[PDB]
Design a protein around this ligand. Structure first.
Ligand SMILES: *C(=O)[C@@H](N)CCC(N)=O
Ligand SMILES: [K+]
Ligand SMILES: [K+]
Ligand SMILES: [K+]
Ligand SMILES: [K+]
Ligand SMILES: [K+]
Ligand SMILES: [K+]
Ligand SMILES: [K+]
Ligand SMILES: [K+]
Ligand SMILES: [K+]
Ligand SMILES: [K+]
Ligand SMILES: [Mg+2]
Ligand SMILES: [Mg+2]
Ligand SMILES: [Mg+2]
Ligand SMILES: [Mg+2]
Ligand SMILES: [Mg+2]
Ligand SMILES: [Mg+2]
Ligand SMILES: [Mg+2]
Ligand SMILES: [Mg+2]
Ligand SMILES: [Mg+2]
Ligand SMILES: [Mg+2]
Ligand SMILES: [Mg+2]
Ligand SMILES: [Mg+2]
Ligand SMILES: [Mg+2]
Ligand SMILES: [Mg+2]
Ligand SMILES: [Mg+2]
Ligand SMILES: [Mg+2]
Lengths: 151, 56, 117
RNA sequence: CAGAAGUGUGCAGC
RNA sequence: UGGGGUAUCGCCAAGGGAAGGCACCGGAUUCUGAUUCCGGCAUCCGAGGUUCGAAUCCUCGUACCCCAGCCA
RNA sequence: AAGGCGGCCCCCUGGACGAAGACUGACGCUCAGGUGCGAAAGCGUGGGGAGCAAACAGGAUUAGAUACCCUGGUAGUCCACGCCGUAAACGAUGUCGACUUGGAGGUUGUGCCCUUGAGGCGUGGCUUCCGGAGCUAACGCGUUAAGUCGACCGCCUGGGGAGUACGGCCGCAAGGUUAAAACUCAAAUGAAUUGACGGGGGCCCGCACAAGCGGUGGAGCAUGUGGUUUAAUUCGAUGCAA
């Protein structure tokens, strides 16, 4: 919008672990409004990640997300006759949104036998600093530093 | 434009002095003026128009 | 090889490239680097960042002689006319003097015709 | 930085 | 006859433990574009000798240019 | 005088203006024909040639690109002595003289006043910008008139054809100058007004873009249309807005 600026809509924290961040993650994994399906998938993935890691569920999720949150992104900036890619310091809320989106979209396209297990594997790899979500973060950073000349 | 950095002068203060000195000397403007030829008719036209706009 | 206490950094900064040359007080070149040679081509070749990188690579090139104090002579209008000096300072040389040596004709020769882009 | 062309011919509002 | 080159990614080009560009492909960018940036499978003219291993050293086989030879 | 004239120094040389007188005594103004000067490009002969750059070559761009952009590059640009004689050679405004409310500045003389200054008041030359009466189709001009008058000269008579043809003069040439007719149309034109438009400027909106999510274009089928077919495949809707 060009007139307005919008105040954020009220979210409700996750009922089992009390996290609004996990609530956002559920809301991103949700499809067609089937909230409870996404909740079941997320809870199964988190408990299996917990028993793999020897960590609490939110602790394992947080340490995974740490490994994939980007620090910079590339933005198209116009000039009177040209357009340049320029690196921009992405703000933390968008960092979390990006990391969750990348985790979810990476897991979705895995081959493993169920979405809960796909998700658990992708979170393990992310916590292990490996795999598709991490390579996504990585190449974003590569592009940013390759464009650093215009910053 | 020449700058001698004094003892205990901060380097960025020396940069500030250098920038202001070379700006005040007009060196960059004189370089930009000379990169292309300008017909004398064009020089006089621009002078005249600048003078014409210098009125309240 | 032979030690040198101090030297002059010559910065040649055109709109298309920046060359940084270190030389002894007598004008014998000790080392050089350029923005275009640091891996920047086209639009990036003439940015202050590319000139900073060129100055850094030039400072890394003269490490043999152990120069500690230098004088900076700046030539030309291009971008990176200043960022090179900051980079040279950060490399740890004592910037003793700064000077602009850009050639100014007292009228002199006729320059090229104006571009009708 | 690139971006060309648009067939002929008409009528009310006093 | 002798000497020296050349035959390595689809094309152009580096290497006693297969790189770069140009293509092609995916992604980012653009009003379309053109232009830019990140990622990608990648491949030593040939037989043998050496050796843990030679695009690579050592003989030979092959093919084509330069210079110099050649009185059935 | 116009074209024009820009580092510093010397030599030769033209004009302008101010103060105070003295002198001559209408000796003045304009000017057909004529004569001289006249940017740049161009021409002749002999030099010089750094930079720039018609022509030309290559690279790009593009549908093409005999261009714009890039890398080179010859005449030319410079000098001496001749020729050419044209320019938006413009203030698009002929020369000369008189008269008619003002204001702010620039530049260059000169007089008076305690000169006290970085000061006050007067009087000439040239020049920039506003604006009054008046004038003008309007825009605008406005004591430097496009105002009110006088003298003389040049020029115009609808748009094309045409500043062309032919003839004359001039020129090494390029060409310059003087200058028609047949024919053809009912307009061509100036200033300003209201819109619209601009790859002009400023400001501001809309799921317009951006940020996201889910789709269409691929498959089968339903349904509408185009085309074809038929005896008939009834008619209408046909960018957005069928
Ligand atoms: C062959 O060459 C024989 N007829 C002569 C020999 C020679 N001249 O070498
Ligand atoms: K004189
Ligand atoms: K005459
Ligand atoms: K040139
Ligand atoms: K075209
Ligand atoms: K030449
Ligand atoms: K007629
Ligand atoms: K001739
Ligand atoms: K009017
Ligand atoms: K579809
Ligand atoms: K469909
Ligand atoms: Mg046509
Ligand atoms: Mg039309
Ligand atoms: Mg000439
Ligand atoms: Mg000549
Ligand atoms: Mg000659
Ligand atoms: Mg050229
Ligand atoms: Mg004329
Ligand atoms: Mg006239
Ligand atoms: Mg006026
Ligand atoms: Mg009059
Ligand atoms: Mg007529
Ligand atoms: Mg004629
Ligand atoms: Mg004639
Ligand atoms: Mg969108
Ligand atoms: Mg379909
Ligand atoms: Mg189809």
């Amino acid at each position: 919008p060009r007139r307005r600026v919008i105040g954020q809509r009220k979210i409700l924290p996750d009922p089992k672990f009390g996290s609004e961040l996990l609530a956002k993650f559920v809301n991103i994994l949700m499809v067609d409004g089937k909230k409870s399906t996404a909740e079941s998938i997320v809870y199964s993935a988190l408990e299996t990640l917990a028993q793999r890691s020897g960590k609490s569920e939110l602790e394992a999720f947080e340490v995974a997300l740490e490994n994939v949150r980007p620090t910079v992104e590339v933005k198209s900036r116009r000039v009177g006759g040209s357009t340049y890619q320029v690196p921009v310091e992405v703000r933390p809320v968008r960092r979390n949104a990006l990391a969750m989106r990348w985790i979810v979209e990476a897991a979705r396209k895995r081959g493993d036998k169920s979405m809960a297990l796909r998700l658990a594997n992708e979170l393990s790899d992310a916590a292990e600093n490996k795999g598709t979500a991490v390579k996504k973060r990585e190449d974003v950073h590569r592009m940013a530093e390759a464009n650093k000349a215009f910053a | 434009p020449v700058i001698k950095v004094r003892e205990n002068e901060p380097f960025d203060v020396a940069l500030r002095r250098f920038k202001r000195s070379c700006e005040k000397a007009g060196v960059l403007a004189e370089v930009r003026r000379r990169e292309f030829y300008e017909k004398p008719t064009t020089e006089r036209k621009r002078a005249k128009a600048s003078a014409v706009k210098r009125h309240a | 090889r032979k030690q040198v206490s101090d030297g002059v950094a010559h910065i040649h900064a055109s709109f298309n490239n920046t060359i940084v040359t270190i030389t002894d007080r007598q004008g014998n070149a000790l080392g050089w680097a350029t923005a275009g040679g640091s891996g920047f081509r086209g639009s990036r070749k003439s940015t202050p960042f590319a000139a900073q990188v060129a100055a850094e690579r030039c400072a890394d090139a003269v490490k043999e002689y152990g120069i500690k104090n230098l004088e900076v002579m700046v030539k030309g209008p291009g971008p990176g006319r200043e960022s090179t000096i900051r980079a040279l300072n950060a490399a740890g040389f004592r910037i003793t003097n700064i000077t602009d040596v850009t050639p100014i004709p007292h009228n002199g020769c006729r320059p090229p015709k104006k571009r009708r882009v």
